[PDB]
Amino acid sequence: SMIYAAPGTPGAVVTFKPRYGNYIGGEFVPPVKGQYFTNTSPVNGQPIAEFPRSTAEDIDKALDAAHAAAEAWGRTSVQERSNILLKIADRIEQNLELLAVTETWDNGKAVRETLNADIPLAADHFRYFAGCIRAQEGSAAEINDSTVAYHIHEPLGVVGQIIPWNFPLLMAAWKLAPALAAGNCVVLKPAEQTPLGICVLLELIGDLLPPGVLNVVQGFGREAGEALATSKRIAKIAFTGSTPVGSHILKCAAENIIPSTVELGGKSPNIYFEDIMQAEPAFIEKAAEGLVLAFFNQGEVCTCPSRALVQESIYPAFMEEVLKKVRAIKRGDPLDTETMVGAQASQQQYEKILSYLDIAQQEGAELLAGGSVEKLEGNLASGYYIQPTLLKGHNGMRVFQEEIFGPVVGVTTFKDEAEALAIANDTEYGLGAGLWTRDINRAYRMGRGIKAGRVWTNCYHLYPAHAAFGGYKKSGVGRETHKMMLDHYQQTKNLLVSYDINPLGFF
Amino acid sequence: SMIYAAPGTPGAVVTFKPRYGNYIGGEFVPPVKGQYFTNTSPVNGQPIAEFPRSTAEDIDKALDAAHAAAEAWGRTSVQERSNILLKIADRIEQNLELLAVTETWDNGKAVRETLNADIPLAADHFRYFAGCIRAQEGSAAEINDSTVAYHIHEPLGVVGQIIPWNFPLLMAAWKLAPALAAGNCVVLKPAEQTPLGICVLLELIGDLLPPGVLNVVQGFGREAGEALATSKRIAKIAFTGSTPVGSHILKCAAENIIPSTVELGGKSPNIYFEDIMQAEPAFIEKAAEGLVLAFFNQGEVCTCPSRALVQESIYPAFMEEVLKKVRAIKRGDPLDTETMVGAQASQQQYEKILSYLDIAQQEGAELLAGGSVEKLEGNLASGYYIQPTLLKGHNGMRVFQEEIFGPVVGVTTFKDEAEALAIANDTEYGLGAGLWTRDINRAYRMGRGIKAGRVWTNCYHLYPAHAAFGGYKKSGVGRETHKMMLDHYQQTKNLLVSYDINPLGFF
Numbered sequence A, B: 001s002m003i004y005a006a007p008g009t010p011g012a013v014v015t016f017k018p019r020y021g022n023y024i025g026g027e028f029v030p031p032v033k034g035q036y037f038t039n040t041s042p043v044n045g046q047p048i049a050e051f052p053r054s055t056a057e058d059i060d061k062a063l064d065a066a067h068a069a070a071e072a073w074g075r076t077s078v079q080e081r082s083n084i085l086l087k088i089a090d091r092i093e094q095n096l097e098l099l100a101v102t103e104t105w106d107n108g109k110a111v112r113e114t115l116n117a118d119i120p121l122a123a124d125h126f127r128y129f130a131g132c133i134r135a136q137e138g139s140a141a142e143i144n145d146s147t148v149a150y151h152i153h154e155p156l157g158v159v160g161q162i163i164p165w166n167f168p169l170l171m172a173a174w175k176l177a178p179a180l181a182a183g184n185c186v187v188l189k190p191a192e193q194t195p196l197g198i199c200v201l202l203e204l205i206g207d208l209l210p211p212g213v214l215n216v217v218q219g220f221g222r223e224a225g226e227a228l229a230t231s232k233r234i235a236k237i238a239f240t241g242s243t244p245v246g247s248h249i250l251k252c253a254a255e256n257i258i259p260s261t262v263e264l265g266g267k268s269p270n271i272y273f274e275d276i277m278q279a280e281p282a283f284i285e286k287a288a289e290g291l292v293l294a295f296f297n298q299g300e301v302c303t304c305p306s307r308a309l310v311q312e313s314i315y316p317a318f319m320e321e322v323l324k325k326v327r328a329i330k331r332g333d334p335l336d337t338e339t340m341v342g343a344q345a346s347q348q349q350y351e352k353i354l355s356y357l358d359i360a361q362q363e364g365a366e367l368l369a370g371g372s373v374e375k376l377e378g379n380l381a382s383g384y385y386i387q388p389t390l391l392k393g394h395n396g397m398r399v400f401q402e403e404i405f406g407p408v409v410g411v412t413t414f415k416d417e418a419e420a421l422a423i424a425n426d427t428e429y430g431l432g433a434g435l436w437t438r439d440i441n442r443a444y445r446m447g448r449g450i451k452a453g454r455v456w457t458n459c460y461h462l463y464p465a466h467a468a469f470g471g472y473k474k475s476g477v478g479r480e481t482h483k484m485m486l487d488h489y490q491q492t493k494n495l496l497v498s499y500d501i502n503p504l505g506f507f
């Protein structure tokens, strides 16, 4: 149990620069038009540093470097690219605390999360894709005695990637590890709310990559992001974030006829069947933790289990176990490892959540816990903290239909399996679901029946590599965190070779 | 040598109905608002039959039937779906001549093409996907001792497919075989120029599929096609056709957040290196036939080798071999197996090609052969026939950059390999390429260097199943004619199962 000192104060593991540049062609550079913005910490509302408010000119300067690097990088051997990714993972792990404190400071989440989930998972994502590129094969098949089809994976070349602020470094790893393993150059546009972590990381790893292979351009969505998403000099666009912006991203890709992948959030149901109350006491506790895991990362998780569906025959008994855990949630300084729920990422997100709490009250949702701002001591008072909130309601309510992205769960009941499936699928989203039952047949039936990319069965919030992650329905298109992604970042070249010297007989 | 009688005349293998319906819910039905259009044969200009000028209401009635069938079809066993596709293939082969004559009549191409390529390839495509769905596996991987990731392929459900007129039945097979193999229901919108073949096919196979699994709605692109492309009741959209419509299709999918694949034509280069004239005489003949293969299907082929790139050191010698074959092309009745080039598909396409021959004259392209309409005898005088045309020019001309989609090849030269690659890649397209060289190293270097989905090496115009077909750059996104496409027609369900009963330690 320990408390990390705030950056720049005595004992801190890091002191940040007062100003950061874009990372282009192997070096930090200022924005072309010299404009900056100020990034603040959500821990205490206080400013951190200045970052470029880049424009189209910077995106094009980054695309120049990426395009000059792409040919030699795409032709770097699989072994060598793999080995570089293994060194990136090493550097992440050797700097685990530094990166975890940076991430907490910039984003607000509890440092026990960055120490145990974000940074280690980010390092492992690089080892995983370093390994999968070693294993990747195209194909060779004999169509007939003198005709052979070869399929060779090729880099797309230069790709654009736009990431959000809820897992700044993990999202970066999710995007960069496969794109780089596949031999592409990247222009990455981080979320303007969280520009710091990727800058610190680039200071740690930048020398491992040839100049121009990894380019990071800071700035606002409707400026730097839009120049990248509409650019005619990228071969592919990747995006994680809001549904309206994602749809716009897909429209930009449609105009240029380039492939696209997007992950757009969800309204994931956590489904609890009655037989869990006949299982072991540890399992009942695990199921209750699975509901309260909705408050992990302050609910700022695309697969946050924001609807709990509890079989009505066990609702009183099971909710007793749930509420014991909600009530024990320790609040405080996000840099205290004891703290279990940190700060929201921005004032805007803070305001969004408070609006939804009012909408919930107005439409008749009943508060079982929380419901208000969390007022914390000292310097934390200027930060953005909300109480873990549990609302009783029905699936027709707005707060059961729209993604809040705060520490808010709506709980409702169902009578039988058919109704649980109907409520679970009564959403436009389809990113994740949780499923709690010890009957193998129900586990399988519900697992197949839920229209979601991931169904966590008797667990929640596990995001290992080697498990494909992505949307059904409006939650998006494509998959991440699995070697199948390499195909989103590569093109298939079919050499169709004839070894027959004779004409076909047609002309 | 055989001459098929014109449909409806003595000796014909088929006589057509005067009016055809939409195929919805297992039966032929009239359009909701009773509007029809007349389909004419491009062989002789004479009308064939009436087909629905369907509206949004018909699209929604087909989606109703598709959605009522989707669940049971999706849960039908792999063996059973495979066996149905195998029966479809047998029915196609059992009616080979009937179907080949129908396709010539509706589309205009020479019956030797439908007899030897279209119909047999259509039959084999069903066998191929019947076989690939037997072999398909998802995955199971142990993440740790108590955590297993399962990935199960699931049908998308109801999908929309829009196909063009240059290979009416083969295009139908290319889209339908994988979609049905994957357990999806289909709403298919055939090209209004060629509605006939798919109707005859449905008469032969409709009883093999459950009602509502396969629905075919005829009509105009701007009406029936647009209703399908903008539908919020499809999980996926597939399209082959023009660049402007395909981009619009991608925008429609963007709005609805659904996966999409499109193939949008090309300007494919056929590259001839000097060493081929050091090869066997048969091989030189084969290469010369490979250039003249541009006139296969009247040049109405997305990968028509419409730019010929000849190394200048062999240009005189090799063009002598080419022109020998150009001069041998027999014209006449497309129902004569001796006819080597049939009719263009429509007046609009016929006129489009004639415009491009005119543009070619004005910009200085030199006629090496052809260049005018082909005036044919008797009833053919009312059909659409253009001479096989060979223009000498340079790659910057409009006729070297824009897709003509008629029997027209632009020939130009290059000095060395670097120049051949630059000219070959000097296009917005990237669907195919032809590559003729017997030096193993040059074949590999150019094969990798060309930005196109398929590089035919020492052959051209082979479209076997089990060789992936699809675009680089503006030629589209996705792949066809290969088992990897099944992923375009399925969702990945990740069951992430924990067998440990203990809480994680976070809440």
Ligand SMILES: NC(=O)c1ccc[n+]([C@@H]2O[C@H](COP(=O)([O-])OP(=O)(O)OC[C@H]3O[C@@H](n4cnc5c(N)ncnc54)[C@@H](O)[C@@H]3O)[C@H](O)[C@H]2O)c1
Binding pocket: B162, B163, B164, B165, B166, B189, B190, B191, B192, B220, B221, B222, B224, B225, B226, B227, B229, B240, B241, B242, B243, B245, B246, B248, B263, B264, B265, B301, B302, B349, B352, B403, B404, B405
């Ligand atoms: N393999 C290919 O990509 C391919 C195929 C055929 C033709 N072409 C080229 O495409 C043109 C042929 O003319 P075309 O008008 O028939 O092409 P097209 O793409 O418009 O027609 C093919 C299909 O598009 C549909 N369609 C048209 N408008 C639509 C809309 N607004 N919404 C939904 N669907 C719509 C139907 O017309 C048809 O089934 C060019 O002349 C030719 O060079 C390319």
Ligand SMILES: NC(=O)c1ccc[n+]([C@@H]2O[C@H](COP(=O)([O-])OP(=O)(O)OC[C@H]3O[C@@H](n4cnc5c(N)ncnc54)[C@H](O)[C@@H]3O)[C@@H](O)[C@H]2O)c1
Binding pocket: A162, A163, A164, A165, A166, A189, A190, A191, A192, A219, A220, A221, A222, A224, A225, A226, A229, A240, A241, A242, A243, A245, A246, A248, A263, A264, A265, A266, A301, A302, A349, A352, A403, A404, A405
């Ligand atoms: N994991 C996720 O799916 C995820 C992540 C963040 C936010 N969200 C949800 O989105 C809501 C709004 O938060 P937000 O405004 O930060 O999301 P956002 O979609 O606006 O921003 C995410 C990223 O897109 C960029 N962007 C914004 N507009 C752009 C444009 N026109 N062109 C190109 N790029 C653009 C942003 O700069 C950022 O990098 C959240 O409350 C939450 O519901 C979801």
Ligand SMILES: [Mg+2]
Binding pocket: A221
């Ligand atoms: Mg925004």
Ligand SMILES: [Mg+2]
Binding pocket: B221, B242, B245
């Ligand atoms: Mg059109």
